[PDB]
């Protein structure tokens, strides 16, 4: 549980990460899967904080069974996209509580992201 606050990312830094994925980093969408149906930011993984706040503490095999992707290694940088309210802030704090000490945050919401032209951002 480090004291290092998450690195703040901007629209362009997230647009660059979506267009050119980096194996060191992962963009984490913390919205509910119900909201991801409206728009999923490409290359993101969905870890809903309201539904499963202890998700990043799950055992590896059960994480893959519950979410159908690999539990990220603890060296990966998890960049939490904003939702609205304190969801992303809570998910980042929970990630650091589970050994994920390399974290980031994109303060913009999905609505803010789509308003700035993120709908056609693709890899």
Task: Give the residue numbers annotated as catalytic, written as ranges.
Answer: 82
Tokens for 95, please give them: 């990630």
Q: Considering Cα of 88, then 93, then 96, then 102, what sign does the dihedral take?
A: positive
Nearest to 79 by CA among 106, 109, 113: 106
């Amino acid at each position: 549980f480090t004291t290092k606050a998450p690195k703040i990312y901007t629209f362009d830094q997230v647009r660059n990460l979506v267009e050119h994925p980096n194996d060191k980093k992962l963009l984490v969408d913390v919205r509910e899967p119900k909201e991801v149906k409206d728009y999923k930011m490409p290359t993101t993984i969905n870890i809903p904080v309201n539904s499963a706040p202890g998700a990043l503490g799950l055992p590896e095999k059960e994480f893959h069974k519950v979410f159908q992707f690999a539990k990220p290694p603890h060296d990966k940088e998890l960049i939490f996209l904003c939702a609205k309210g304190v969801r992303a802030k809570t998910a980042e704090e929970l990630a650091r509580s589970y050994g994920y000490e390399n974290t980031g945050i994109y303060p913009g919401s999905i609505t803010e992201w789509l308003a700035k032209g993120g709908a056609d951002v693709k890899p």
